Nucleic acid binder design. Structure first.
Ligand SMILES: [Mg+2]
Ligand SMILES: [Mg+2]
Ligand SMILES: [Mg+2]
Ligand SMILES: [Mg+2]
Ligand SMILES: [Mg+2]
Ligand SMILES: [Mg+2]
Ligand SMILES: [Mg+2]
Ligand SMILES: [Mg+2]
Ligand SMILES: [Mg+2]
Ligand SMILES: [Mg+2]
Ligand SMILES: [Mg+2]
Ligand SMILES: [Mg+2]
Ligand SMILES: [Mg+2]
Ligand SMILES: [Mg+2]
Ligand SMILES: [Mg+2]
Ligand SMILES: [Mg+2]
Ligand SMILES: [Mg+2]
Ligand SMILES: [Mg+2]
Ligand SMILES: [Mg+2]
Ligand SMILES: [Mg+2]
Ligand SMILES: [Mg+2]
Ligand SMILES: [Mg+2]
Ligand SMILES: [Mg+2]
Ligand SMILES: [Mg+2]
Ligand SMILES: [Mg+2]
Ligand SMILES: [Mg+2]
Ligand SMILES: [Mg+2]
Ligand SMILES: [Mg+2]
Ligand SMILES: [Mg+2]
Ligand SMILES: [Mg+2]
Ligand SMILES: [Mg+2]
Ligand SMILES: [Mg+2]
Ligand SMILES: [Mg+2]
Ligand SMILES: [Mg+2]
Ligand SMILES: [Mg+2]
Ligand SMILES: [Mg+2]
Ligand SMILES: [Mg+2]
Ligand SMILES: [Mg+2]
Ligand SMILES: [Mg+2]
Ligand SMILES: [Zn+2]
Lengths: 138, 151, 208, 237
RNA sequence: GCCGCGGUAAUACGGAGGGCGCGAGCGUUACCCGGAUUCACUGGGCGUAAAGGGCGUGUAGGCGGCCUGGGGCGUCCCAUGUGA
RNA sequence: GGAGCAAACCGGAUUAGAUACCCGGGUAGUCCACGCCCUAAACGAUGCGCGCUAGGUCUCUGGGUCUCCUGGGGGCCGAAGCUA
């Protein structure tokens, strides 16, 4: 049914990285890409190619992971430690340029859709705008 | 060089035919105030032995406590079992604001000023083990970007 | 009003010289070089590991008992200090030293803080040329503290000022020994004066 | 030599396990032709080089490697390949804490060199025959378990495993001790917990030997003087 | 105040000595917020701790898939008034 | 409608008592129709729909080029993860 596509993707990613894999797909969307467009440019991931799955257009998303640690649990650190949806379809979150977040005192990023396209916690403050606060990642 | 400091001691009790026997629990914190702390829990038939073997274990466990001038680099929280701890970084002149458990750990790691609260379970033992993970999961602006460059 | 009575007993309740006496709390002991242990029937008895609370309680009493000031007036300052920004802890002692009865003790006009109060109180002290009989008076940069004419004598003043020769003043003060005048140059950072008191423990005691 | 042809490796030396596997043999698996999973011999090499490269880099700088193989299929092959390299080994039942508690385990090697050098000493008959026999029986016990552990009076710098699964216990402390792990493992055990893997038949002597036999040659070529192809093709198959 | 003290050795009752804490105040009672993250928007739960309706069907209601255009209500920026 | 069974009831036992447990009888009821009642340990003590995250083995039921692969079910052990 998918009452929330965006969230589905975020979770689609969250569930892959947790088990460590090279790439997981996700249904194509103009709005969906502009979101991944942020993660690439912010290095949160590698990239993605508008691949195709049985006539249906998906988006093979490529994940980065830290260096193979040693000792008990050699599994590497996460490039994307945490990601959760903010403005959900059951509750939209709208903030002005003065009410913008502050993920991990700068150490993180926040993605929001505004009247000037898909921006960042920063760009929003730089541009001087504000809109629906999508999520947070670090 | 290292500064030991046990913040929890107790007397458990097992039971056997006629009466009940006792072991002793020792929760000790070790550090240097440079940004290196360790936590170890020591059980032993008597008090000292535990305390002594607490610091033994407490030195076996350490940490990369990155200090941005007596504080931590970012805002972190960690859930261990049913217990929860909140570390929010504070500007100098504030001081350590926390229960008698967590402050004992932040001191031996330096930390001049920080804001915290204990949520959920207040059990020190689980609060302790909960605090180390928090620190063991701090990342400076440096530790971060490295990752976000890849290859 | 202020505290009155046994004080050498405090000198040794905290377990540290604090020179609340003139010569004595400064001679061979605050009664301590004799008995460096706590007052009361239970003096020569071992102590129990003081709790994190009792430590901050003790380290606080210490500081307040030093300036000999009521818990009233006292906390008022910490709050005013805490109200500010920077460090507060450092700012705190800043407001402590700015007291009139304090300046007098430092400027050697008197030996003890409790002697310094009697001075200010009775009106034998000046400020930019004003009769200031209020020990609560807070002083700022450049303020001149001298003696009044009706008092510029008294066999007790010459002694105090005289003893002040062969002694120095704080990096934040300056005394015209031969004239009976002094000046408050600046607010003395934590450095400018060292003490048996860890402020940071006093900050904690107030965040109950 | 360190060179190894893909022809002699053609016998069983590539996956003999099927569905009794750990699904993490992804990269290290070719196809399921006829029940068993067959391992892509190609990648083996690359994993080998990477592994041997560390083996020599470590052997040529005067290190020590501990060999573990309780398996009966690769039981004695370690004894001859470990003795032929002067290195320690575990031919029998691997004991707990042999590393993490190496400090106290050692004390029990120390009972042996006291028993060892008391088989010929003077004060022997002086102790009643009732007390003897048992002692030498005990001595036999110690030797049985500690022959390849008798040497190495300190933790190795790495450990070689005939199978990380059969011995996960052995990797677990080792791994808790930051000690690097080399091992041969068929689709049975999972990688990841392995630092340097020999992705091949960890059973069937033919495969095992083939490896270790030469493998140990590369261990000698770290100090100089690689001689005869140590004992092997005995009653092989 | 809570946990609890008193049974012929009570640091828990009563007095004394002594000590701790305040000071023209020190206590008590009552009431509001805090701690209580214990109504949880920030910021919680429902297998066994309190908690999934006995099960469906369906009304209103809440929620809703990929592309493109008009409108620009919500949302966002600026400007100005008001907010004594 | 009523063979068997069997609350209530009667008798025999056991027991200090035995309004029970055991034995012999036995009415409603248990059965059908029609109309009520609407409860329950009505339980997987787990609301419904959709997506995502290792696999191994047993079984029911499909489809296929029928060692096998593939769909819908029904159990067990278990990756990661959650859990006091
Ligand atoms: Mg443990
Ligand atoms: Mg929880
Ligand atoms: Mg609780
Ligand atoms: Mg508690
Ligand atoms: Mg401030
Ligand atoms: Mg407070
Ligand atoms: Mg008595
Ligand atoms: Mg008693
Ligand atoms: Mg009492
Ligand atoms: Mg009493
Ligand atoms: Mg008294
Ligand atoms: Mg008393
Ligand atoms: Mg009152
Ligand atoms: Mg408060
Ligand atoms: Mg809520
Ligand atoms: Mg709750
Ligand atoms: Mg639920
Ligand atoms: Mg119950
Ligand atoms: Mg229940
Ligand atoms: Mg139900
Ligand atoms: Mg329902
Ligand atoms: Mg109902
Ligand atoms: Mg229903
Ligand atoms: Mg509808
Ligand atoms: Mg709608
Ligand atoms: Mg829509
Ligand atoms: Mg539109
Ligand atoms: Mg305005
Ligand atoms: Mg009867
Ligand atoms: Mg009868
Ligand atoms: Mg009778
Ligand atoms: Mg009957
Ligand atoms: Mg009958
Ligand atoms: Mg009736
Ligand atoms: Mg369900
Ligand atoms: Mg069929
Ligand atoms: Mg199924
Ligand atoms: Mg299970
Ligand atoms: Mg697990
Ligand atoms: Zn004195």
């Amino acid at each position: 049914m998918l009452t929330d596509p965006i969230a589905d993707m975020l979770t689609r990613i969250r569930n892959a990285t947790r088990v460590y894999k090279e790439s997981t797909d996700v249904p194509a969307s103009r709005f969906k890409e502009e979101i991944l467009r942020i993660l690439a440019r912010e290095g949160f991931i590698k990239g993605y190619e508008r691949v195709d799955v049985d006539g249906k257009p998906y988006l093979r998303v490529y994940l980065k992971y830290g260096p193979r640690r040693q000792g008990p649990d050699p599994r590497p650190e996460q490039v994307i430690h945490h990601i959760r949806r903010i403005s959900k379809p059951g509750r939209r979150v709208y903030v002005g340029v003065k009410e913008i977040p502050r993920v991990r005192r700068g150490l993180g990023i926040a993605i929001l859709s505004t009247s000037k396209g898909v921006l960042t916690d920063r760009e929003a403050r730089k541009l001087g705008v504000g809109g629906e606060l999508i999520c947070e990642v670090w | 060089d290292f500064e030991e400091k046990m913040i929890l001691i107790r007397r458990t009790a097992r039971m056997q035919a006629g009466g009940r026997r006792f072991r002793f629990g020792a929760l000790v914190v070790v550090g240097d105030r440079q940004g290196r702390v360790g936590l170890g829990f020591g059980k032993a038939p008597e008090v000292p032995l535990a305390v002594q073997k607490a610091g033994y274990y407490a030195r076996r466990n350490m940490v990369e406590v990155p200090l941005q001038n007596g504080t931590i680099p970012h805002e972190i929280e960690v859930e261990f079992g049913a217990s929860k701890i909140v570390l929010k970084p504070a500007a100098p002149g504030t001081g350590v604001i926390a229960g008698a458990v967590p402050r004992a750990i932040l001191e031996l790691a330096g930390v001049t000023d920080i804001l915290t609260k204990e949520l959920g379970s207040r059990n020190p033992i689980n609060i302790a083990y909960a605090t180390m993970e928090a620190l063991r999961q701090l990342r400076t602006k440096a530790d971060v970007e490295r990752l976000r460059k890849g290859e | 009003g202020r505290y009155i009575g046994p004080v050498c007993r405090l000198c040794r309740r905290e377990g540290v010289k604090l020179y609340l006496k003139g010569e004595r709390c400064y001679s061979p002991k605050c009664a301590m070089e004799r008995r460096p242990y706590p007052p009361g029937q239970h003096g020569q008895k071992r102590a129990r590991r003081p709790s994190d609370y009792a430590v901050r309680l003790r380290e606080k009493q210490k500081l307040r008992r030093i300036y000999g000031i009521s818990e009233r007036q006292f906390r008022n300052l910490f709050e005013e200090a805490s109200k500010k920004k920077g460090v507060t802890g450092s700012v705190f002692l800043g407001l402590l030293e700015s007291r009139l009865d304090n300046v007098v003790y430092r400027l050697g006009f008197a030996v003890s803080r409790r002697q310094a109060r009697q001075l200010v109180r009775h009106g034998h002290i000046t400020v930019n040329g004003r009769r200031v009989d209020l020990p609560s008076y807070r002083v700022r940069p450049g303020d001149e503290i001298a003696v009044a004419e009706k008092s510029r004598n008294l066999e007790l003043i010459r002694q105090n000022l005289e003893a002040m020769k062969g002694r120095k003043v704080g990096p934040w003060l300056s005394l015209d020994v031969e004239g009976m005048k002094g000046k408050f140059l600046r607010l003395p950072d934590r450095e400018d004066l060292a003490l048996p008191v860890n402020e940071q423990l006093v900050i904690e005691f107030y965040s109950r | 030599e360190i060179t190894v042809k893909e022809l002699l490796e053609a016998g069983v030396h590539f996956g003999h396990e099927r569905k009794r596997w750990n699904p993490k043999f992804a990269r290290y698996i070719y196809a399921e032709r006829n029940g068993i999973h067959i391992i892509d011999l190609q990648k083996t090499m690359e994993e080998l080089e990477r592994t041997f490269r560390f083996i020599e880099d470590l052997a040529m700088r005067g290190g020590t490697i501990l060999f573990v193989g309780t398996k009966k299929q690769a039981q004695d092959i370690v004894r001859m390949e470990a003795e032929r390299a002067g290195m320690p080994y575990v031919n029998q039942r691997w004991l707990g804490g042999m590393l993490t508690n190496f400090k106290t385990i050692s004390q029990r090697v120390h009972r042996l060199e006291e028993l060892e050098a008391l088989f010929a000493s003077p004060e022997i008959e002086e102790r009643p025959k009732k007390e003897q026999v048992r002692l030498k029986h005990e001595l036999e016990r110690l030797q049985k378990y500690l022959s390849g552990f008798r040497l190495l009076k300190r933790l190795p710098d790495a450990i070689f495993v005939v199978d990380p699964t059969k011995e996960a216990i052995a990797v677990r402390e080792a791994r808790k001790l930051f000690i690097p792990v080399i091992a041969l493992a068929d689709t049975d055990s999972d990688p990841d917990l392995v630092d340097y893997i020999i992705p091949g038949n960890d059973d069937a002597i033919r495969s095992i030997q083939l490896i270790l036999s030469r493998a140990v040659d590369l261990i000698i070529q770290a100090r100089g003087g690689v001689v005869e192809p140590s004992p092997s093709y005995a009653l092989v198959q």
